[PDB]
Design a protein around this ligand. Structure first.
Ligand code: HEM
Ligand SMILES: *[C@@H]1O[C@H](CO)[C@@H](O[C@@H]2O[C@H](CO)[C@@H](O[C@@H]3O[C@H](CO)[C@@H](O)[C@H](O)[C@@H]3O)[C@H](O)[C@H]2NC(C)=O)[C@H](O)[C@H]1NC(C)=O
Ligand SMILES: *[C@@H]1O[C@H](CO)[C@@H](O)[C@H](O)[C@H]1NC(C)=O
Ligand SMILES: *[C@@H]1O[C@H](CO)[C@@H](O)[C@H](O)[C@H]1NC(C)=O
Ligand SMILES: C[As](C)(=O)[O-]
Length: 446
């Protein structure tokens, strides 16, 4: 099975901290960088084992990942077996029908050699650890960009910026996770490079790693909320209820985490909070035609677009096991301030906030990149539906900056289209490789 002593913590279990910093660096002096990578970083890289034990949480959890150009800067010229990783995310932007005009300039290029993920319960601890790293490495490293992120405050902890409980759904790794009801079950090699049934040849030092797809996704929260009020379906329910319904129809879950498939007309917070129930569905319903029924959940809903379940065949009763190879592990975390009074009032965002999106997978072409291009951005996915035009994912679907046509959202008429402005704005990111911990003070320091 998996050697969890040698797998970086964020890949499989997440950092388990209130605050994170994504610290994007260039390598100036490989020789000196390597010395300190081996001596100072490697020994303190947090493993899955370490982060899985409540009694061995580090004060600051550290992970580290390298871009293609970072590996080359280290003289590591081996083929990692991933062309998307090699080319970098900036080159991939066309695949997602987005312009680099909105990108963080530092992302729009291949100058970034890596990212250090620091995680801690206070920003003070993170800041001090940055100081220690910079003093240790000196001018052998340059900070190019950073992004601070945090779990949201109070009762919104674990919710993303639109207000929805996040981090319910992940693939279970066969032989490692004990699966929850409804959860997909996949080979380790879907997530971990060189692991069980990863068909791609890797360098030996890379066995136990994963590809990290980072995306800085700004969310326009006041704009989103206004759209919901303005386009809420008619009905006998209150305006707030009907606006909330439309939001949940877009996501596929209510804010509590309750899947709309299991509770189509109102939130069920007891269900949302219950990990034994809140993923226990396939999209199939007795007496309903899977191909045309959007009364439980639109074909276009975010979670349905990103894990189709019964939409791609297989069991109509849970768990559905379809499309395991297109699973991602998600370790995203919100960034930016809470929505301010003035923004709430004006419906207009002025302070950047959103999701520091992190997806892990063994093949970028099967994971994040696939979900975004082949499913979310595909107006005829899922296939074989009636009507055939599902439209785009209303959360992440992109159409070159144009409003997205999204069908199925209104319960009264599945043929009714909404034309929806983007509420998520990509500011880009990069593809990294999080190596096994042994490689950090091993090959990468040699
Ligand atoms: C800021 C942008 C995004 C927001 C606000 C967002 C929000 C959410 C929410 C609220 C959930 C439901 C929580 C859960 O089931 O765990 C979810 C699930 C998910 N999202 Fe996102 N998401 C975003 C971007 C992305 C992107 C870019 C992808 C991949 C291309 C992605 C893939 C997924 C997947 C795979 C699931 C779980 C689906 C399942 O297993 O049923 N999301 N997202
Ligand atoms: C996850 O969801 C499934 C359904 O998709 C749940 O299984 C269902 O559980 C209910 C209540 O326990 C079962 O009800 C039974 O129906 C049979 C009809 O054959 C009846 O003879 C019994 O008297 C009873 O009413 C239902 O059969 C069962 N369905 C299936 C397909 O297994 C399951 O309980 C959920 N898991 C969790 C942890 O909630
Ligand atoms: C924000 O949008 C809501 C709903 O459309 C509207 O009632 C309100 O007047 C808007 N705020 C401003 C400042 O226009
Ligand atoms: C359903 O929506 C379609 C597409 O806009 C429209 O042509 C049709 O008239 C609608 N049906 C009803 C009953 O509103
Ligand atoms: C999942 As059912 C009880 O609507 O067939």
């Amino acid at each position: 099975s998996l050697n969890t002593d040698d797998i970086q913590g964020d890949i499989l279990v997440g950092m388990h901290k209130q605050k994170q910093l994504f610290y994007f660096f260039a390598i100036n002096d490989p020789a000196t960088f390597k010395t300190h990578l081996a001596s100072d970083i490697a020994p303190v890289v947090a493993s899955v084992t370490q982060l899985s034990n409540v009694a061995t949480q580090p004060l600051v959890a550290l992970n580290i990942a390298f871009s293609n150009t970072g590996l080359l800067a280290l003289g590591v010229t081996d083929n990692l077996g991933d062309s998307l990783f090699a080319n970098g995310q900036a080159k991939d932007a066309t695949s997602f029908k987005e312009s680099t005009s909105s990108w963080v300039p530092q992302f729009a290029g291949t100058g970034i050699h890596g990212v250090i993920i620091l995680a801690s319960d206070t920003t003070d601890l993170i800041d001090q650890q940055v100081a220690s790293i910079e003093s240790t490495f000196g001018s052998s490293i340059s900070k190019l960009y950073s992004l601070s992120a945090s779990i949201r405050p109070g009762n919104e902890a674990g919710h993303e910026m639109f207000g929805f409980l996040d981090g319910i759904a992940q693939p279970a790794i066969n032989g490692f996770n004990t699966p929850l009801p409804g959860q997909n079950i996949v080979d380790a090699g879907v997530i971990i490079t060189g692991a069980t049934n990863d068909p791609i040849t890797r360098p030996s030092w890379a066995v136990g790693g994963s590809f990290l797809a980072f995306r800085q996704l700004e969310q326009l929260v006041p704009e989103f909320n206004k759209y919901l009020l303005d386009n809420a379906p008619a009905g006998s329910g209150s305006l707030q209820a009907r606006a909330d319904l439309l939001g949940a129809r877009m996501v596929g879950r209510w804010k509590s985490g309750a899947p709309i498939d299991l509770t189509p007309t109102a939130d069920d917070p007891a269900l949302g909070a219950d990990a034994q129930r809140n993923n226990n569905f396939t999209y199939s319903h007795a007496g309903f035609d899977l191909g045309s029924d959007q009364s439980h959940c639109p074909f276009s809903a975010h979670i349905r677009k990103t894990r189709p379940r019964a939409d791609l065949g297989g069991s109509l009763t849970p768990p559905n096991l379809s499309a395991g190879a297109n699973s991602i592990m998600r370790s995203g975390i919100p960034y930016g301030p809470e929505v301010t009074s003035a923004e709430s009032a004006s419906n207009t965002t002025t302070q950047e906030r959103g999701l520091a999106f992190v997806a892990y997978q063994a093949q970028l072409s099967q994971g994040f990149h696939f979900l975004q291009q082949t499913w979310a951005d595909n107006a005829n996915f899922p296939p074989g539906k009636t009507p055939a035009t599902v439209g785009l994912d209303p959360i992440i679907g992109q159409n070159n900056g144009q409003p997205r046509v999204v069908n199925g959202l209104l319960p009264s008429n599945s043929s009714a289209s909404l034309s929806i402005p983007q509420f998520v704005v990509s500011h880009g990111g990069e593809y990294f490789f999080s190596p096994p911990i042994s490689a950090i003070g091993g090959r990468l320091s040699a």
